[PDB]
């Protein structure tokens, strides 16, 4: 019989701060983490701004010797994980290490390191490729390195489902616990795609906002004048724990994870369907999994990428799933402030949805100056909204028509 799963620890790096509370204070103040990128010369690029992690000190977590071997996305995922585990108060023992696993994912993983080693190969030759090229760049090594540093011998894996990765990672980790394959999982995602290939690759697809003039105003989900997503870096990690296990050790419980939905659009490799049919199927799957009436949903943390087709598809999916109740819930895109952390987006947004439950506040959609046609829901324009939230939903949609929905509720 299926066990209940609760959130006992959370950890983050985002464009708004180097931990959860600093990121969350920025979210509730309506602060933007988007700025011109300083780490490289981007005059040749149509987009020259993004959400960078500012002032990250990897030596808060790892020796300089080890850090040098690891792509930033792995450094970011370990930081978030180490925070989440510390925040949980869990002690790893011989009695429990086989029951604790990790599922930290990434959309693209070690693209900076792969580019750097590619430049070495092309300019010099294969003799100049780093010996750490593979273990320092491949996506499964957040889970790998985290298990090595903390002694976690439970299920050890990584998802890579593009912009859905962090939501899927958290959902399937919950399934592991629910079905008895583990008692604790560290789950979420990490991303640092801000290199020549990532900025150039998304730019070649004309997927990014090109508002270089006002980087902080570029991410404007459901605004009439949106022109694509803002590329952002960082990590989110959550400690998921079986309810009785958490109760038994006197753990602080943030919220319960009650529902998870997946669906494939089977529509298009990059475009969502205009009517959000895939998103609707996924949200209904998640609400049925949670045993809910759709009217119980109080807050939705939207995918809300600031893409013309993506944003309107989500309105359509929410109206389809919730009917008249769509006008009573609050829905916001924290990507208005953070930009789009890709494989990490679902991980930081899960955390923001849990904090919305803790603090009974809907985060704003900043930059929502002129809501587009049919975008007439409560999208929490401009300013945080204190309100009752018993049930919070976090949505992600990705390339390949992959959808994920997590349902969290307050724990009594």
Ligand X SMILES: CN(CC(=O)O)C(=O)c1ccc(F)cc1
Q: Which 206-235 positions form the footprint of ligand X (CB under 6 A)?
A: 207
Is 270 among the residues that bind ligand X (CB under 6 A)? yes
CA nearest neighbour of 162 among 195, 125, 191? 191
Is 262 among the residues that bind a second copy (CB under 8 A)? yes
Q: Determine which residue in the list 143, 232, 235, 330 makes contact with a second copy, applying CB under 8 A.
A: 143
From 82-90, 130-138, 156-164, 166-174, span contacting ligand X (CB under 6 A): 130-138
Residue 40 structure tokens: 């490289």
CB of 312 to ligand X, least distance (A): 16
Q: Determine which residue in the list 205, 244, 252, 266 makes contact with ligand X, applying CB under 6 A.
A: 205
- For the chain, state the CA radius of gyration: 20
Q: Which is nearer to ligand X, 136 or 261 (CB)?
A: 136
Compute how many residues bind ligand X; rule: CB under 6 A.
Answer: 8
Is 132 among the residues that bind a second copy (CB under 8 A)? yes
Q: Which 365-404 positions form the footprint of ligand X (CB under 6 A)?
A: none
255-264 vs 402-409, strand pairing mode: antiparallel
Q: Which 289-328 positions form the footprint of ligand X (CB under 6 A)?
A: none
Backbone torsion region of residue 381, taken as left when φ is above 0, otherwise alpha when ψ lies between -120 and 50, otherwise beta: beta
Q: Which is nearer to ligand X, 155 or 166 (CB)?
A: 166
CA nearest neighbour of 408 among 364, 348, 362, 357? 357
Is 268 among the residues that bind a second copy (CB under 8 A)? yes
For 189, residues 6+ apart whose C-beta sits below 8 A from its C-beta are: 77, 104, 105, 106, 107, 159, 165, 166, 169, 235, 236, 341, 343, 344, 345, 346, 347
- DSSP secondary-structure letter at 336? H
CA nearest neighbour of 172 among 190, 163, 185, 162? 185
* Cβ count within 10 A of residue 328: 12
CB of 62 to a second copy, least distance (A): 13
Q: Which 175-194 positions form the footprint of a second copy (CB under 8 A)?
A: 175, 179, 181
* Cβ count within 10 A of residue 386: 10
Q: Between the CA of residue 126 and those of 70, 115, 123, 136, 287, what are the distances in Å? A: 19, 14, 10, 17, 52
Residues composing the chain: 412
Is 135 among the residues that bind ligand X (CB under 6 A)? yes
CB of 220 to a second copy, least distance (A): 22
Instruction: Give the span between the Cα atoms of 51 and 339, in whole angstroms.
Output: 6
Is 55 among the residues that bind ligand X (CB under 6 A)? no
Q: Determine which residue in the list 61, 200, 275, 382 makes contact with a second copy, applying CB under 8 A.
A: 200
CB of 159 to a second copy, least distance (A): 6
Is 138 among the residues that bind ligand X (CB under 6 A)? no
Residue 199 interacts with which of a second copy, ligand X, none, CB < 5 to 8 Å by class = a second copy
Instruction: Give the span between the Cα atoms of 204 and 255, in whole angstroms.
Output: 41
Is 269 among the residues that bind ligand X (CB under 6 A)? yes
Instruction: Give the span between the Cα atoms of 70 and 136, in whole angstroms.
Output: 4
Q: Determine which residue in the list 49, 76, 202, 397 makes contact with ligand X, applying CB under 6 A.
A: 202
Is 157 among the residues that bind a second copy (CB under 8 A)? yes
Q: Which is nearer to a second copy, 257 or 379 (CB)?
A: 257
CB of 134 to ligand X, least distance (A): 5
CB of 369 to a second copy, least distance (A): 29
Q: Which is nearer to a second copy, 20 or 280 (CB)?
A: 280
Q: Determine which residue in the list 71, 265, 311, 378 makes contact with a second copy, applying CB under 8 A.
A: 265
- DSSP secondary-structure letter at 92? -
CB of 120 to ligand X, least distance (A): 16
For 132, residues 6+ apart whose C-beta sits below 8 A from its C-beta are: 69, 70
CB of 117 to a second copy, least distance (A): 6
- DSSP secondary-structure letter at 318? H
CB of 202 to ligand X, least distance (A): 5
State CA 176 to chain mean position distance. 19
Residues that bind ligand X (CB under 6 A): 131, 134-135, 202, 205, 207, 269-270
């Amino acid at each position: 019989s299926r066990r209940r799963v609760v959130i006992t620890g959370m950890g983050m790096l985002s464009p708004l701060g180097l931990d959860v509370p600093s990121s969350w204070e920025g979210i509730l103040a309506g602060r933007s983490g988007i700025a011109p990128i300083e780490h490289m010369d981007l005059s040749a690029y149509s987009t020259r701004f993004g959400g960078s992690v500012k002032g990250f000190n990897v030596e808060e977590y790892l020796s300089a010797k080890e850090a040098r071997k690891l792509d930033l996305f792995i450094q970011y995922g370990l930081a978030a994980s180490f925070q989440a585990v510390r925040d949980s108060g869990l002690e790893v023992t011989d009695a429990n290490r086989e029951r604790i696993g990790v599922s930290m994912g990434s959309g693209i993983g070690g693209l900076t390191n792969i580019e750097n080693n590619c430049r070495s190969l092309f300019e010099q030759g294969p003799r100049r490729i780093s010996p750490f090229f593979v273990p320092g760049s491949i996506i499964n090594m957040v889970s790998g390195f985290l298990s090595i540093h903390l002694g976690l011998q439970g299920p050890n894996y990584a998802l890579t489902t593009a912009q859905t990765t962090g939501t899927h990672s958290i959902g399937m980790a919950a399934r592991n616990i629910a079905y008895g394959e583990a008692d604790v999982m560290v789950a979420g995602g990490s991303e640092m795609a801000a290199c020549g290939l990532g900025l150039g690759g998304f730019g070649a697809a004309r997927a990014l906002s090109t508002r270089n003039d006002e980087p902080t105003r570029a991410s404007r989900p459901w605004d009439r004048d949106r022109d694509g997503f803002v590329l952002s870096d960082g990590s989110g990690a959550l400690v998921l724990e079986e309810l009785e296990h958490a109760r038994a050790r006197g753990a602080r419980i943030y919220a319960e994870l009650v529902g998870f939905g997946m669906s494939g659009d089977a529509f298009h490799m990059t475009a969502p369907p205009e009517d959000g049919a895939g998103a609707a199927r996924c949200m209904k799957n998640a609400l049925r999994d949670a045993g809910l009436d759709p009217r119980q949903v109080d807050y939705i943390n939207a995918h809300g990428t600031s893409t013309p087709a993506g944003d309107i598809a989500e309105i359509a999916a929410v109206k389809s799933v919730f009917g008249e109740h769509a006008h009573a819930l609050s829905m916001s895109s924290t990507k208005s402030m953070t930009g789009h952390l890709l494989g990490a987006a679902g991980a930081v947004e899960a955390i923001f949805s849990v904090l919305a439950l803790r603090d009974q506040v809907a985060p704003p959609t900043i930059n929502l100056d002129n809501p587009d046609e049919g975008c007439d829901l409560d999208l929490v324009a401009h300013e945080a909204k204190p309100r009752k939230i018993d049930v919070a939903l976090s949505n992600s949609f990705g390339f390949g028509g992959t959808n994920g929905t997590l349902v969290f509720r307050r724990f009594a």
